[PDB]
Design a binder for this molecule. Structure first.
Ligand SMILES: *[C@@H]1O[C@H](CO)[C@@H](O[C@@H]2O[C@H](CO)[C@@H](O[C@@H]3O[C@H](CO)[C@@H](O[C@@H]4O[C@H](CO)[C@@H](O)[C@H](O)[C@H]4NC(C)=O)[C@H](O)[C@H]3NC(C)=O)[C@H](O)[C@H]2NC(C)=O)[C@H](O)[C@H]1NC(C)=O
Ligand SMILES: *[C@@H]1O[C@H](CO)[C@@H](O[C@@H]2O[C@H](CO)[C@@H](O[C@@H]3O[C@H](CO)[C@@H](O)[C@H](O)[C@H]3NC(C)=O)[C@H](O)[C@H]2NC(C)=O)[C@H](O)[C@H]1NC(C)=O
Ligand SMILES: *[C@@H]1O[C@H](CO)[C@@H](O[C@@H]2O[C@H](CO)[C@@H](O)[C@H](O)[C@H]2NC(C)=O)[C@H](O)[C@H]1NC(C)=O
Ligand SMILES: *[C@@H]1O[C@H](CO)[C@@H](O[C@@H]2O[C@H](CO)[C@@H](O)[C@H](O)[C@H]2NC(C)=O)[C@H](O)[C@H]1NC(C)=O
Ligand SMILES: *[C@@H]1O[C@H](CO)[C@@H](O[C@@H]2O[C@H](CO)[C@@H](O)[C@H](O)[C@H]2NC(C)=O)[C@H](O)[C@H]1NC(C)=O
Ligand SMILES: C(=C\c1ccccc1)/CN1CCN(C(c2ccccc2)c2ccccc2)CC1
Ligand SMILES: CC(=O)N[C@@H]1[C@@H](O)[C@H](O)[C@@H](CO)O[C@H]1O
Ligand SMILES: CC(=O)N[C@@H]1[C@@H](O)[C@H](O)[C@@H](CO)O[C@H]1O
Ligand SMILES: *[C@@H]1O[C@H](CO)[C@@H](O)[C@H](O)[C@H]1NC(C)=O
Ligand SMILES: [Ca+2]
Ligand SMILES: [Ca+2]
Lengths: 48, 948, 96, 48
């Protein structure tokens, strides 16, 4: 799936909209383990 | 087929069997003797119709004067307090303290009140302060809102001061032009919230005067797409700001101007008419080129009609378009040179067309220019035109401050049917030296005090009148402010098809059965003149199944503090009433002892009318327990009764003895009678007595005697009345209850006719069959019908199984021919407040058409032949004497196999009457005499351009 | 055409109704292999026009040729890929 | 003027006048969202 996303960006489909969706202020699934309360901390500024 | 003589004698035997059984078992003459036996426990008092109406009209005028005084005392403070306001622009330090409804703060502090529950209010309230309502689309904490939120805090003290003299005061509300509404007493607001105080009918009438609106809709090609959807929505949401005093019409133009509907001239814009225009608006398509000269020429011609009824007031043209390069200045210089017609122009949609000519059109003609880019701006831009129309009224001054009253409508805070007073509030800042005059020509808001219809009903007592007598007040427009047929439900229009904000405006001719004489009475009341008329009227029964004709007397006078007119309907035999006089201690204890639930085995099952005997005895709607509270109050209270009226308690106690003395002396001797299942006595005092305890469990009638359909019907008739049971397995009662027969007693005290009670029995159907037989023949059919064409005694077993059914649903061929030969007349009428199950294109309100059948000809013997296809069917019709029954014999339907359409007598959903032809000959009405428009001192220099 | 004809015709409406539940509908599983709507009170039946109003689909030769030409110009090809992922599954469409 | 069929929104890439036609043709040449304008033009003539 990551390789498919990278191919999508390589063809330049909506790469800027993918980039805008990886910023720090994002929700991530409860399946991953994290401290309760801080739920929107996942996501990084290095996406740009 | 037996001869006429042999069938006349056959029915002669049975009419003696039925009458004698009801005469003796019920004991009609025994009750008459009991009333005449004493003649000293009560006195006969006259019932002067002329005196009653003036007294009742004086109380309504006085009641509406307390609220009028509570409004001028409330609007004067608002004008003075606001003129002293300083317009602070920073509330972070001096926060505003207020209670905001619909809740559990940058520049405000919230209040948590106490919220005590009380009576005369369906909800929990608090007299400590006043709640504030702010619309969802209005941000609290803005400078405009916060400044208004300060100077209105001075209304709290005058809210309390108003309520101290009159503790019976309902909601007092101030609707500001900023959007917020502050009402007293504080109470929580009532899904999302869409209430805006500026769009309420009580706010709109005080904002401006009646108007002759005329909406011009651009249906050229350029408006196709999204901007047509907004035009149709803006027009629909703008007709919602038109009351019954405003006349509107809608036109469209695309190289040719035409009406969008069936009206062709200005119509009254009531609930029904506005539905037609609204339906016709969501049908228009965009096509063609734009022609403004033809559109405006057609619009200016309808405003100058003067043949039809109009408002003779504000004349305004509304232009819903997008943009163009045509100014049409040659038309405005021809049709309105004196600027007697305002032109408001709306530019709707997202576009780049020239709005210059649209802006210029609204500036020369004292109008205003509005922008509606999206749906969010539709609701607010379609109500700001009342700021322009209120300009001449502000400059009038003290002569424009007149209290007005709305149409009857349902209160927003779930209070029931109410009417609201109205009085505008003006800017006064700088008026002492008369130097500002810039924003001073726009109203601050509207003041209002609610009056409930139950408040008015307490000023017109009806328990000294006959159950057929009632008060009914009218309106200039003809609608009823007070009527027994007015229900707390919205009036329906059309048919509800699926794939409360409107007022309850019920016309007088729609409340009861229309008549040529009654139209004259309605017109004489509208123009405000007293009078009186006695005439024969045919009256619909309480249950919409029978029609009976009896003499009535209408007495009306105008309530000439306000513009209402009060009338009192009063039949004959009710100009006198039984007034109870009794102060002896032991004669009331014995009478009250008859009300004990324990000894029903010796006095019969007893019901009590839930009247307001005393203020501390709450109505229960149970009667099983309510009687327990009533009689336990009698022995636990001093018989002097200083807090509640003895007149309403002396009557019920006096009727308690009379009903019991019939049971003990007469009914007790005959424990069981072959043809009798129950015996009941219903009196004017308000009690019912069913002798058998077991048979007293089947009494499904209303405990209140004034609401009993058979009681009211038996007074009009001078003979035994047979009431057919219901059908469709509507609970129990078909065989185990019986057939109800009633006969009102008539007493002559001093040459005066009086009908204080009714008596009757319940004839068992199974034992009546045995008498009737002395059977299931395939070649002959014999049925008995009452006044209304309902089966009461059949012959074919299966026919008897479907007892109490309309004859047209079991033998349509015979019933239709009966109507033609003039034995069963019928009169159709509409019910505008009804709820019906919707069909295809829970439940919704709708109009349902009612049909009632009754005896047309006085003649008793009928005969003839009906032809239903190559066959000859003969029948004989004889009517029972001293009874509303008719016996019909005809040979069975098997001989002639024909079956036409069924004739239904039921609450059938309809959409009529047609509104396209009612506007051709509308009912008479009188418009308001106040007309505030075309003032020379008006500025109107801010057309649409200073704002952008 | 050979692999898939008329697979993008099943969006999840409301129960016992004819109105699409979502504002941007996507196909269900054709045979219970792709995507299933699990919204409270939703079910899907073959009575949907298509993703782009019926313009983008593989149920005709002209429609298939238009879709192929649209995808070969690297314009909206991922949209068709994801719609076929919703319809069929996650194994066949990515190769095509 | 045939791009007024949606009735729910206003479309920016149209052929309403000469400047907008030039902008839309340039956008089609660059290849960005040319299929969206093609769909709009197809639905302007009735549909699929
Ligand atoms: C009854 O009438 C009186 C006067 O006839 C009226 O009081 C007047 O209220 C206005 C506010 O609308 C005051 O205007 C002052 O001057 C300007 C004009 O708005 C304001 O400055 C900015 O104005 C822009 C609009 O152009 C506005 O968007 C912005 O928020 C304002 N503030 C900024 C940019 O900081 C002033 O703030 C405003 N107030 C001052 C200077 O204190 C008039 O001064 C008022 N006139 C008098 C004599 O007091 C009153 O509102 C009317 N009643 C009601 C209910 O509206
Ligand atoms: C708009 O809001 C203003 C502030 O929220 C109100 O102004 C304040 O009103 C208080 C009481 O009315 C004043 O308190 C007293 O004022 C009198 C002068 O009349 C003096 O004795 C003192 O200043 C003071 N007394 C005390 C504190 O014991 C405030 O002075 C006054 N101003 C402020 C707080 O800045 C306005 O009343 C209000 N407008 C309306 C119409 O209610
Ligand atoms: C309506 O107003 C009139 C007068 O304004 C009231 O007429 C009174 O009628 C009685 C008897 O007919 C006279 O004794 C009074 O003298 C009249 N009043 C005056 C001022 O002359 C009439 O009562 C008012 N309507 C009601 C319902 O009270
Ligand atoms: C009613 O309106 C019409 C036109 O809107 C007025 O014009 C007259 O119409 C009647 C026939 O309908 C005729 O007398 C003439 O054809 C018209 N002119 C004149 C001078 O009468 C009409 O005056 C209005 N009023 C009435 C009572 O018809
Ligand atoms: C109620 O019913 C009566 C009886 O059918 C109707 O009035 C009759 O109308 C016919 C023709 O329309 C006349 O020939 C009769 O003379 C009328 N009888 C009357 C006036 O007593 C009509 O449907 C209703 N009448 C009302 C409401 O007054
Ligand atoms: C699309 C290629 C593509 C781009 C991003 C992502 C995926 C494919 C096709 N072509 C379209 C035209 N463009 C260029 C272009 C550059 C060189 C030669 C021809 C065209 C263009 C378009 C309009 C105006 C100036 C320049 C170059 C690419
Ligand atoms: C002949 C006829 O109408 N019979 C009715 C039936 O239609 C109805 O369903 C039922 C109610 O339970 O009452 C009975
Ligand atoms: C936990 C919860 O209540 N979620 C709902 C449940 O109530 C409902 O019965 C079910 C029916 O599909 O959908 C889910
Ligand atoms: C209010 O109206 C009543 C009549 O309904 C009247 O008796 C009374 O004087 C009026 N005023 C007050 C303050 O009660
Ligand atoms: Ca792209
Ligand atoms: Ca145009």
């Amino acid at each position: 799936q990551a390789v498919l996303l990278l191919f999508r960006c390589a063809t330049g489909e909506a790469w800027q909209e993918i980039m805008l969706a990886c910023l720090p202020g994002k929700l991530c699934d409860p399946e991953s383990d994290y401290n309760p309360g801080e739920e929107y901390t996942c996501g990084s500024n290095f996406a740009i | 087929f037996p001869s006429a003589v042999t069938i006349k004698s056959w029915v002669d035997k049975m009419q003696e069997d039925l009458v004698t059984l009801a005469k003796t078992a019920s004991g009609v003459n025994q009750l008459v003797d009991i009333y005449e036996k004493y003649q000293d426990l009560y006195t006969v008092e006259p019932n002067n119709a002329r005196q009653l109406v003036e007294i009742a009209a004086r109380d309504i005028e006085k009641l509406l004067s307390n609220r009028s005084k509570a409004l001028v005392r409330l609007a004067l403070e608002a004008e003075k307090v606001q003129a002293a306001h300083q317009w602070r622009e920073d509330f972070a330090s001096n926060e505003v303290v207020y209670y905001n409804a619909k809740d559990d703060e940058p520049g405000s502090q919230r209040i948590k009140p106490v919220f005590i529950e009380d009576a005369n209010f369906g909800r929990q309230i608090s007299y400590q302060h006043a709640a504030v309502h702010i619309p969802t689309d209005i941000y609290e904490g803005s400078t405009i809102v916060l400044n208004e939120l300060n100077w209105t805090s001075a209304l709290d003290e005058v809210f309390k001061k108003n309520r101290e003299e009159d503790p019976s005061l309902l909601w007092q509300v101030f609707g500001s032009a900023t959007g917020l509404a502050r009402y007293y007493p504080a109470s929580p607001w009532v899904k999302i919230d869409l209430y805006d105080v500026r769009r309420r009918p009580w706010y709109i009438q005080g904002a401006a005067s009646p108007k002759d609106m005329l909406i011009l809709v651009d249906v050229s090609g350029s408006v196709s797409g999204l901007t047509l959807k907004l035009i149709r929505t803006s027009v629909s949401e703008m007709l919602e700001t038109l009351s019954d005093d405003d006349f509107v019409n809608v036109a469209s133009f695309n190289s040719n101007a035409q009406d969008v509907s069936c009206f062709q001239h200005l119509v009254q814009a009531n609930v029904r008419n506005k539905k037609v225009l609204k339906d016709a608006v969501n049908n228009i398509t965009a096509k063609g080129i734009t022609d403004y000269k033809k559109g405006f020429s057609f619009a200016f011609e309808q405003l100058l009609n003067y043949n039809v009824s109009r408002a003779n007031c504000n004349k305004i043209i509304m232009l819903f378009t997008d943009g163009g390069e045509e100014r049409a200045q040659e038309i405005f210089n021809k049709y309105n040179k004196d600027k007697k017609v305002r032109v408001f122009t709306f530019s709707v949609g997202q576009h780049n067309y020239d709005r210059g000519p649209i802006q210029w059109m609204a500036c020369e003609n004292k109008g205003y220019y509005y922008e509606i880019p999206s749906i969010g701006a539709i609701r607010i831009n379609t109500q700001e035109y009342l700021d322009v129309l209120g300009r001449p009224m502000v400059l009038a001054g003290d002569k424009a401050k007149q209290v007005q009253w709305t149409n009857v409508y349902l209160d927003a805070l779930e209070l029931g049917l109410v009417i609201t007073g109205t009085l505008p509030v003006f800017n006064i800042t700088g008026q002492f030296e008369n130097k500002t005059n810039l924003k001073n020509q726009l109203i601050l808001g509207v003041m209002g005090v609610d009056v409930s219809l139950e408040d008015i009903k307490r000023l017109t007592p009806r328990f000294t009148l006959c159950p057929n007598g009632y008060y009914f007040a009218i309106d200039p427009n003809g609608y009823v402010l007070l009527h027994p047929n007015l229900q707390p439900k919205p009036i329906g229009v059309g048919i509800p098809t699926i794939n409360s904000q409107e007022p309850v405006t019920l016309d007088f001719l729609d409340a009861e059965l229309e008549n040529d004489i009654k139209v004259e009475i309605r017109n004489k009341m509208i123009d405000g003149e007293s009078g009186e008329k006695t005439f024969r009227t045919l009256v619909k029964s309480q249950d919409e199944r029978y029609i009976d004709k009896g003499n009535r007397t209408y007495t009306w006078t105008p309530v000439n503090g306000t513009d209402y007119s009060l009338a009192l309907v009063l039949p004959t035999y009710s100009f006198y009433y039984i007034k109870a006089k009794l102060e002896e201690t032991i004669t009331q204890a014995r009478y009250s002892e008859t009300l004990k639930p324990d000894n029903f085995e010796e006095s019969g099952y007893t019901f009590i009318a839930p009247r307001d005997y005393c203020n501390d005895l709450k109505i229960s709607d149970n009667n099983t327990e309510f009687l327990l509270n009533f009689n336990e109050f009698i022995d636990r209270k001093t018989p002097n009764n200083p807090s509640c009226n003895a007149d309403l308690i002396n009557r019920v106690l006096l009727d308690a003895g009379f009903t019991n003395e019939l049971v003990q002396n007469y009914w007790s001797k005959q424990k069981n009678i072959k043809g009798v299942k129950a015996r009941f006595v219903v009196t004017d005092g308000g009690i019912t007595r069913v002798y058998p305890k077991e048979a007293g469990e089947n009494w499904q009638e209303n405990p209140e005697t004034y609401e009993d359909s058979f009681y009211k019907r038996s007074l009009d008739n001078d003979n035994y009345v047979f009431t057919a049971p219901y059908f469709n397995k509507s609970g129990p009662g078909a065989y185990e209850s019986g057939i109800m027969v009633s006969k009102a007693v008539e007493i002559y005290i001093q040459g005066k006719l009086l009908k204080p009670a009714v008596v009757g029995i319940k004839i068992d159907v199974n034992s009546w069959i045995e008498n009737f037989t002395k059977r299931n023949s395939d070649v002959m059919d014999c049925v008995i019908l009452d006044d209304g064409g309902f089966l009461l005694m059949a012959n074919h077993d299966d026919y008897t199984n479907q007892i109490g059914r309309f004859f047209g649903e079991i033998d349509p061929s015979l019933m239709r021919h009966l109507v033609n030969i003039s034995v069963y007349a019928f009169n159709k009428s509409y019910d505008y407040q009804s709820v019906c199950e919707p069909g295809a294109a829970s439940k919704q309100s709708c109009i349902t058409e009612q049909t009632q059948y009754f005896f047309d000809n006085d003649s008793k013997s009928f005969s003839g032949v009906l032809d239903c296809g190559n066959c000859s069917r003969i029948f004989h019709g004889e009517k029972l004497m001293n009874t509303n029954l008719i016996f019909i014999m005809v040979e069975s339907k098997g001989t002639c196999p024909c079956d036409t359409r069924l004739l239904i007598q039921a609450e059938q959903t309809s959409d009529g009457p047609n509104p396209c032809d009612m506007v051709k000959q509308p009912r008479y009405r009188k418009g308001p005499d106040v007309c505030f428009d075309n003032n020379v001192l008006e500025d109107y220099t801010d057309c649409g351009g200073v704002s952008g | 055409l050979e692999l898939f004809i008329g697979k993008m015709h099943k969006t999840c409406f409301f129960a016992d109704s004819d109105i699409v539940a979502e504002e941007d509908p996507a196909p269900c599983a054709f045979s219970g292999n792709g995507r299933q709507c699990t919204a409270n009170g939703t079910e899907c039946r073959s009575g949907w026009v298509g993703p782009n109003g019926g313009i983008t689909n593989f149920d005709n030769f002209a429609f298939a040729m238009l879709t192929v030409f649209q995808c070969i110009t690297m314009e909206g090809w991922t949209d068709v890929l994801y719609w076929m992922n919703d319809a069929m599954g996650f194994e066949l469409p990515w190769v095509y | 003027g045939k791009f007024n069929f949606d009735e729910t929104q206003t479309k920016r890439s149209t052929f309403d006048n000469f400047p907008q036609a030039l902008l839309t043709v340039f956008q089609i040449l660059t290849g960005e969202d040319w299929n969206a304008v093609m769909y709009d033009g197809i639905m302007a003539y009735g549909g699929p």
